[PDB]
Amino acid sequence: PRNSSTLNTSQGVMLDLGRHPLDETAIKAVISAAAEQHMQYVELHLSDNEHLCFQSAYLGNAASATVLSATTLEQLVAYANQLNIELVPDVDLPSHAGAILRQLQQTHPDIYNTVKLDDETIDYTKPAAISLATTLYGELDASFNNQSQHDLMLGADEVPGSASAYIELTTFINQVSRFQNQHGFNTSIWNDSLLKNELTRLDSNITINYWSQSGNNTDVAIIADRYANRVSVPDILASGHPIVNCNSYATYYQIKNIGNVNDDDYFINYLNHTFRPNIFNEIDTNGHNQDWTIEDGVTTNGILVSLWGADSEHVTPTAIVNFIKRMTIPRSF
Ligand SMILES: CC(=O)N[C@H]1CN2CC[C@H](O)[C@@H]2[C@@H](O)[C@@H]1O
């Protein structure tokens, strides 16, 4: 399978629009900031449980300053292209899909009843769920097409299901990835819903964004289960998938907290001076979340910084942009 992605050797920033919507003016200022800081891409997390921030012809939602029309997205892609920045759509499925589901209930109540697993999740074991996913992604691919590099984050974080259900999650991801490849797009997913036993069945051109082996769990029984059953970085190296380091200690920050001088200073200084690209957040042999796991087998250096948006309505675009302008993501081990 073709894998033209270079995200595994790139530096980028992710904006959580699904929790903290932004308009075109603000997103252009983020793109500019990323370019000033020598980043290669900006990832737009366009939907989550809270908000649906892309217009879909199929879903029938109305556009606005923050529900980005195809024309607005095309303008942002053209702006990014002028600054030599890749714009990476990021539309979470099958979970973190509450806003898509609420809209689908209104315009396709039939399809909603078929595909709703829970309030946040489409039923990825059913053919109707893959059909929905490819319909939405095909629409977005066209809006994001007029640039050199084509990547979309499918996500697949925090997915509900049994171990048996997860077998069907692999199939869902692969079918969507193959559809995307037909449209010239590479696909990324998070690591946390990936079983060891499924990893070799996941297409090898799918990039895995590695945030936390435990999914930021502290319950010791959950940790034990994820240590035994969920992918490590060594597992991913053995399977041959590309990796992006999204270490949840070093690379995650809540928009809500921007402007807190000490916290901002620690995050920035740790990122800029202490963190290294081969340092992952994995479970150690003592059952601890070890955010400083050195992986000597990793030869690539990709890092994404994630700005998560819950409960951050009053944080301004200027504050977000100025925080990005402080970042110098490390490139050397
Ligand atoms: C990939 C991932 O981090 N998934 C979720 C869990 N993380 C952990 C830190 C945030 O809650 C963030 C949340 O906003 C995300 O939706």
Torsion of CA 212, 214, 220, 226, to 10 degrees: -150
Q: What is the CATH number of domain 7-324?
A: 3.20.20.80
Nearest residue (by CA) to ligand 1, atom 15, is 308
Domains of the chain: which residue ranges?
7-324
Pocket of ligand 1 (CB under 6 A): 96, 157-158, 190, 211, 216, 252, 308, 310
Q: Tokens for 252?
A: 């995650």
Cα–Cα distance measured from residue 111 to residue 264, given in angstroms and rounded to the nearest whole number: 44
Resolution (in Å) of the shown entry? 1.0
Nearest residue (by CA) to ligand 1, atom 1, is 157
Q: Positive or negative, the Cα torsion across 94, 95, 101, 103?
A: negative
Minimum-distance ligand 1 atom for the alpha carbon of 309? 14
Distance 110 CA to ligand 1 centre (A): 31
CB 190 within 8 A of CB 208: yes
Distances (CA, A) of 150 to 4, 32, 81, 229, 330: 9, 19, 12, 32, 24
Q: Where are the beta strands (DSSP E) in the chain?
A: 11-16, 41-47, 86-93, 116-118, 121-122, 151-155, 186-190, 207-210, 243-245, 252-254, 279-283, 289-294, 303-308
Cα–Cα distance measured from residue 132 to residue 122, given in angstroms and rounded to the nearest whole number: 9
Cα–Cα distance measured from residue 329 to residue 273, given in angstroms and rounded to the nearest whole number: 9
Cα–Cα distance measured from residue 40 to residue 305, given in angstroms and rounded to the nearest whole number: 12
Minimum-distance ligand 1 atom for the alpha carbon of 16? 14
Helix (H) or strand (E) segment spanning residue 119: none
Q: Which residues pair with 186 in a beta bridge?
A: 151
If one residue of 14, 50, 158, 245 were mutated to test the ligand 1 pocket, choosing by the most ligand atoms within 8 A of its CB, it would be 158
Cα–Cα distance measured from residue 70 to residue 54, given in angstroms and rounded to the nearest whole number: 8
